[PDB]
């Protein structure tokens, strides 16, 4: 029985319970920076394109 077609949304509050400090303030800042450093896919879009381009001009 498929669910592809072509009610009001609530939260399981017992599940949110089951799953700020200045010392914790630091841990969060460091994660945020780690994450920003990691997400650099923007830096290399041009490069990737040129690589695809010349692999085509190979033939």
């Amino acid at each position: 029985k498929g669910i592809l077609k072509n009610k009001s949304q609530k939260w399981d509050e017992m599940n949110i319970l089951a799953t700020l400090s200045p010392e914790e303030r630091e841990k969060k800042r460091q994660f945020e920076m780690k994450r920003k450093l990691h997400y650099n896919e923007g830096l290399n879009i041009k490069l990737a394109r040129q690589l695809i381009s010349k692999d085509l001009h190979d033939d």
Binding site: L4, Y39, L47
Partner: protein
């Protein structure tokens, strides 16, 4: 003639093993998966309208062992229905096993198993962030080209019971009508700007009023009130997206009107985040199944 049951069996054979055990499918089988899945994607809407119940997952990034842990927790198809938000390849060790199992399940249960496009399902990101290198090492560059062709046909967003809007990244300043998503033609590459780029690239940001610049150097950030207005206009209750690793696997935004889901725990051996999956039941009640970080 493609043996889907055999493909799945073989991929599922490593279920008990230590993380990183490879599965070696045949080249032609992998092509088969791409061609058959591409066909199904093109035949279904680019904007999925779906019914609960279902499980929604965020980024996997080739963490195959963790993909198997998710199905273990949530139920292997068809025990449960699935919607994945993208980012299946890159970053991790086993992009191939990951996408192959997902493509195989797409083919086996085409109306109970769904895959959206992420920003990594794109040649401009794929060339560099691991997938190309993986295809070359284990098979050939031609296989990567085949995957690219498949990815270009992936659907872009889903609406669950007219209430939950799902896409990989988030909103777009250009998203005024759902019809604009429906009008996007496939196959298509991801543009550098505009609607399709934003749906896969944008981020929520607490400190931004309206639309702001994105540290990524692509697309935008959007504030809480932008989310609120959108839900109001389109008569929805929740935005569900992926795209950013978060410490507990999921994270709420804008008084719970948006949730970020990220399914790869211990993300690429660089973070020690948990991974989460969202269970949506028949009354649209949402709960979270957490994959804890390594003890």
């Amino acid at each position: 003639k493609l043996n889907i049951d055999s493909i799945i069996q073989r991929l599922l054979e490593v279920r008990g093993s230590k993380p990183g055990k490879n599965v070696q499918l045949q080249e032609n089988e992998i092509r088969g998966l791409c061609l058959k899945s591409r066909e199904i994607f093109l035949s279904q809407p680019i904007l999925l309208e779906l019914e609960a119940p279902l499980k929604i997952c965020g980024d996997i990034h080739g963490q195959y062992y963790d993909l198997l842990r998710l199905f273990e927790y949530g139920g292997f198809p068809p025990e449960s229905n699935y919607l994945f938000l993208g980012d299946y390849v890159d970053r991790g060790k086993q992009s191939l096993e990951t996408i192959c199992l997902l493509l195989a399940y797409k083919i086996k249960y085409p109306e109970n198993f769904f895959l959206l496009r992420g920003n990594h399902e794109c040649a401009s990101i794929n060339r560099i962030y691991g997938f190309y290198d993986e295809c070359k090492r284990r098979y050939n560059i031609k296989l990567w080209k085949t995957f690219t062709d498949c990815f270009n046909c992936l659907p872009i967003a889903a609406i669950v019971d007219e209430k939950i809007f799902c896409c990989h990244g988030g909103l777009s300043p250009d998203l005024q009508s759902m019809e604009q998503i429906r009008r996007i033609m496939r196959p298509t590459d991801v543009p550098d700007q505009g609607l399709l780029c934003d749906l896969l690239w944008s981020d929520p940001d607490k400190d931004v009023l309206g639309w702001g610049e994105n540290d990524r150097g692509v697309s935008f950030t959007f504030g809480a009130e932008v989310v609120a207005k959108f839900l109001h206009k389109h008569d929805l209750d929740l935005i569900c997206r992926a795209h950013q690793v978060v410490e507990d696997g999921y994270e709420f935004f804008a008084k719970r009107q948006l949730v970020t889901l990220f399914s790869a725990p211990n993300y690429c051996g660089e973070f020690d985040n948990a991974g989460a999956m969202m269970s949506v039941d028949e009354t649209l009640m949402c709960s979270f199944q957490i994959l804890k970080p390594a003890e």
